[PDB]
Amino acid sequence: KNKVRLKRHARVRTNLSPRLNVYRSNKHIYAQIIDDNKGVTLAQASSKDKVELATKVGEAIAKKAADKGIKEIVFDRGGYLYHGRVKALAEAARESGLEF
Amino acid sequence: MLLPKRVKYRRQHRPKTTGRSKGGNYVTFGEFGLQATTTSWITSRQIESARIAMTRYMKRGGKVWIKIFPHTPYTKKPLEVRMGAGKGAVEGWIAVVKPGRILFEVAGVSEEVAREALRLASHKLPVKTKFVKRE
Amino acid sequence: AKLQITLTRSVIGRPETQRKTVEALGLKKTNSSVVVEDNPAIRGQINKVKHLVTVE
Amino acid sequence: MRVNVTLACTECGDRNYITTKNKRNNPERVEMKKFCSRENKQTLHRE
Amino acid sequence: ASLKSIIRQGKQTRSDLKQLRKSGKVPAVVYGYGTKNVSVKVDEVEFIKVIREVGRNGVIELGVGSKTIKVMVADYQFDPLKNQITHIDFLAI
Amino acid sequence: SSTKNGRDSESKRLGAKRADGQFVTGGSILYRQRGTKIYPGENVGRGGDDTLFAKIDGVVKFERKGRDKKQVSVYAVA
RNA sequence: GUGACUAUAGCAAGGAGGUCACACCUGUUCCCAUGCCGAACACAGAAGUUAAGCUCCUUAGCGUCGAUGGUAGUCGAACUUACGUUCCGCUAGAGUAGAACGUU
RNA sequence: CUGGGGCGGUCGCCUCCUAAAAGGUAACGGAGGCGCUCAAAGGUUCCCUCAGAAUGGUCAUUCAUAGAGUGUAA
RNA sequence: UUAUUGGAGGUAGAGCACUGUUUGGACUUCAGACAAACUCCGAAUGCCAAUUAAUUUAACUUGGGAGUCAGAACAUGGGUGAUAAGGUCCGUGUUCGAAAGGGAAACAGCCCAGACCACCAGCUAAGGUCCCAAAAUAUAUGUUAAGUGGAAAAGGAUGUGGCGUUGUGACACUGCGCCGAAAAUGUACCGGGGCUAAACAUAUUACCGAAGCUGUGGAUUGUCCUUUG
């Protein structure tokens, strides 16, 4: 799937992009806000730090960004579908204070 | 006599006759051959005459390869007409031969029968030639 | 100011860019002679028109 | 074959947005949602 | 077999090569382990009567560094309209 | 023996319109093309009709996109 | 994970490496799902397995990179009709590299 | 218009070639088309990947950088 | 204009990786070819810039007044024609047009060279140096016997020289010659006489040769102010 999840992500990322990029797994979710003109990361969030934990990771990434002084973002669904887990990952950062 | 079976374009600009030969300069299919030493257009009708001479001389014993093929159709206009009013009708098919190309190759024959056959061929082709043997 | 360059052939019947080069060297008439400090870029002008000049 | 139709705001203001339709494949009085700029609003158009 | 070849040095202009070819010399190039691309000249007949002796895929001692290195003949160009070899490739080992 | 040929079309002035290293304005056309022989880089708009134009005022630069595809970007001067 | 680079970055082959991650695998309860099928997308997951996917290594068969030297081709002269000098400099083919580097 | 004129052909627009690697470039030079068509064949968000060669009895599998398709010529 | 750099682009060439044409083998495949409308490739040049350095004299805008819209030859890249035409139609440069002077015998377009005027001055360019006709019967070395030089092919051939490989003969390049070579007023395809060097090829020496350049005088415009000269 990742050999084709990556293809849908490269399809996504032709118009879009700082990034708030994601990565699902069988049990974990790897969120991270990344610059896209230096390759630099700005914040961090993982699952080992299925929707309760999606809200957990969303809150974590949002409060880390709040410590890091950045508000307005662009959300990359990374080629996954915007639904359920990634749905909640988007609706946690808005509810933690952020711009989508 | 010889001609391609399909051509995409009946009418073509005529090939460059000035320069040297780019490919087919070394005996490949056989032992002996006739190398060209002068540029011209060889028509299918005279390619065939040279082949007939070479074939009948060897008793139809040895093997021959006609290394050149006429791909290019030259046109001509009718008897007594003025210039213009379109390009003419296909007269025949020609190959362009430049200094160094190997017109015919033979094998299955000693040097002397092959030499006389190739000599008797070179008199029906509008170019000068010489006798060549594989390296 | 090395490179004493003299115009020794005419420019009648020479291409026009060549006529431009020799005038940009400052050679007015035939047998005229300009002194010009040897550059790496003034030398490239006396190769466009090597046949019509004499250098020394 | 194609008619050269003329749309006309249902409510207010009329006869803008010329287009063309296909009569045999649309033998009906077509309808659109266009910007009636007279009354500065999205509104229906006919004909 | 034994061959002596002296280096050609400088930029080989057009006239220079056309002088070496209307004299009886064949330009050559050498390379392989330890050779390091000495552009050389060889006798246009001596090479014939050495390679026709040692055969096509033989072994040849040349004037490489004024010493022998057991060279090969990778490729060779051949102006056929005069039957004259035009360039040789000596692949060392 | 008349002929059924001869007619052609008006040639449409097509291709590069600025130079690699040149200062361009905010809406200048950088290249004209059918299809995409050169894709739009950064701050380059790939307008309709497939023409490539600049957006900001800057210096133009033809780069490549890996192998077999090249792009045009525009930069800020100084 | 995630970016940058012209595959010297790929293919193809042999070889090991496990639930710590990544996987496949349990199933349709749940949100959602096929113009039929939880095959897919997605949801609830603990078994079980290193076979496959896959990270890591060997390989120069296939692709890709590719000199030095020579040749063709011409820019400009200069004789005359195809050469001669100057100068740039091909493709092809071999010497070769090469099983990638790499930012956060 | 016209390799005298008449007869024949043509006349506006598009895509190639000639055209000489910027653009431009003629002939009664070599090839084709146009005088429309879509209310979804437009917009937008998502999802997917073709042609063909074989193994079988529309299907399935594999091989496959594109040889498909792109309303309509190139 | 040139040097340095960056660039776009698909011509020459080349190649068969795609579309087509094709030759010989073996049962898709190995070798070999072809292309204006074929491209895995790909120049030299030309073009665009830097707001990139050294020389040089333009560039542009605004206005007044125009003529031009029958072009030609040669060199090179092509189409058409028949790789005919002093043909025709395009790109590229030059000369004529609107250009006199020297050479090509004479000869708008070929080569040299751009006339302000005068001189019974000098140096040279193309081209030349036995006489017509100014200047070498020059110097060194070789070739050619046909008057080749001073017109023409396939093809032929113990012409003659050079170098080369061969076991006295044979061949591979080769330079120069021979035959093929018949037309209409009068030799009549060196301008003529004549030429065996006064031909050819190569290599240093001289000299001749223009209205070019220089020398001397003069006439006009200009621009620096050496220094209103």
The dihedrals phi and psi of B5, each to the nearest 5 degrees, come to -85, -40
Helices (H) and strands (E) in chain F, counts: 0, 8
Are chains B and F touching, using the cut-off of 8 Å on CB pairs and a minimum of 3 such pairs? yes
Domain boundaries of chain B, sorted by first residue: 23-135
User: Is nucleic acid strand I under 7 Å from F20's C-beta?
Assistant: yes
User: Is nucleic acid strand H under 7 Å from D20's C-beta?
Assistant: yes
Protein-to-nucleotide distance from the CA of F28 to the C1' of G7, whole angstroms: 37
Chain B residues with beta carbon closer than 8 angstroms to that of F2: 85-86
**Residue D35: which residues within 8 A CB-CB, separation 6 or more?**
D41, D42, D43
User: Is nucleic acid strand G under 7 Å from E53's C-beta?
Assistant: no
User: Which residues does chain A break after (C to N > 2.5 Å)?
Assistant: 17, 49
Here the CATH number for the domain that contains residue D36 is: 2.20.28.120
Residue B108 has which token pair?
């299955």
Side-chain half-sphere CA neighbours of F50 within 13 A: 11
Are B26 and E81 a contacting pair at CB < 8 A? no
Chain F residues with beta carbon closer than 8 angstroms to that of B87: 3
- Determine the length of chain A: 100
Are chains C and D touching, using the cut-off of 8 Å on CB pairs and a minimum of 3 such pairs? no
Residues C4 and C56: beta-carbon distance below 8 Å? yes
Residue F68 has which token pair?
């077999």
Domain span holding position D24: 1-47
Question: How many CB atoms are closer than 10 A to CB D32?
Answer: 14
Are E80 and B35 a contacting pair at CB < 8 A? yes
Domain span holding position A47: 15-100
Resolution in A: 3.1
**CATH number of this structure's domain B23-135:** 3.90.1170.10
DSSP E50-70: HHHHH-TT--BB--BTTB---
Chain F residues with beta carbon closer than 8 angstroms to that of B11: none
Side-chain half-sphere CA neighbours of E70 within 13 A: 3
- Cα separation, E38 vs E67, whole angstroms: 12
Protein-to-nucleotide distance from the CA of B38 to the C1' of I26, whole angstroms: 36
Residue C56 has which token pair?
């020394």
Instruction: Report if residue A91 sits inside a domain.
Output: yes
Residues E78 and B24: beta-carbon distance below 8 Å? no
Q: Which nucleotides of H are covered by protein (CB under 7 A)?
A: 2-4, 8-19, 22-33, 36-39, 46-49
- Cα separation, E51 vs F41, whole angstroms: 59
CA–chain centroid gap for E41, Å, is 6
Interface of B with E in 55-84 (CB under 8 A): none
User: Is nucleic acid strand I under 7 Å from F70's C-beta?
Assistant: yes
Question: In B47-69, which positions are buried (b, 16+ CB within 10 angstroms) versus exposed (e)?
Answer: bebbbebbbebbeeebebebbbe
Q: How many domains does chain D have?
A: 1
Residues B68 and B95: beta-carbon distance below 8 Å? yes
Protein-to-nucleotide distance from the CA of A34 to the C1' of G26, whole angstroms: 36
Longest C-alpha distance within chain A, in Å? 35
Residue A4 has which token pair?
């084709």
Residues C30 and C8: beta-carbon distance below 8 Å? yes
Burial of E29 (0-12, 13-18, 19+ CB in 10 A): middle
Q: How many domains does chain E have?
A: 1
Query: Which chains does chain B touch, 3 or more C-beta pairs < 8 A?
Result: E, F
Nearest partner of A98 among A42, A16, A38, A47, judged by Cα? A42
Domain span holding position E37: 1-93
**B25 in contact with chain E, both atoms CB, cutoff 8 A:** yes
Amino acid letter, F40: P
Here the CATH number for the domain that contains residue A48 is: 3.30.420.100
Residue D15 has which token pair?
């006869």
Chain E residues with beta carbon closer than 8 angstroms to that of B128: none
User: Is nucleic acid strand H under 7 Å from A4's C-beta?
Assistant: yes
- Cα separation, E19 vs E41, whole angstroms: 12
Residue D25 has which token pair?
């494949």
Torsion angle (degrees, nearest 10) of CA E41, E44, E49, E52 = 90
Amino acid letter, B67: K
Amino acid letter, B110: S
Q: How many domains does chain A have?
A: 1
The dihedrals phi and psi of B102, each to the nearest 5 degrees, come to -100, 100
User: Is nucleic acid strand G under 7 Å from E91's C-beta?
Assistant: yes
Here the CATH number for the domain that contains residue E24 is: 2.40.240.10
User: Is nucleic acid strand H under 7 Å from D18's C-beta?
Assistant: no
Chain E residues with beta carbon closer than 8 angstroms to that of B37: 81
The dihedrals phi and psi of C25, each to the nearest 5 degrees, come to -80, -15
- Cα separation, E48 vs E44, whole angstroms: 7
- Cα separation, F41 vs F70, whole angstroms: 9
Residue B105 has which token pair?
């190759």
Chain B residues with beta carbon closer than 8 angstroms to that of E80: 25-26, 35, 100, 132
Residues F41 and F59: beta-carbon distance below 8 Å? no
Instruction: Report if residue A8 sits inside a domain.
Output: no
Domains of chain C from N-terminus onward: 1-56 (3.30.1390.20)
Which nucleotide has its C1' atom closest to residue F17's CA? I48
User: Is nucleic acid strand G under 7 Å from E76's C-beta?
Assistant: no
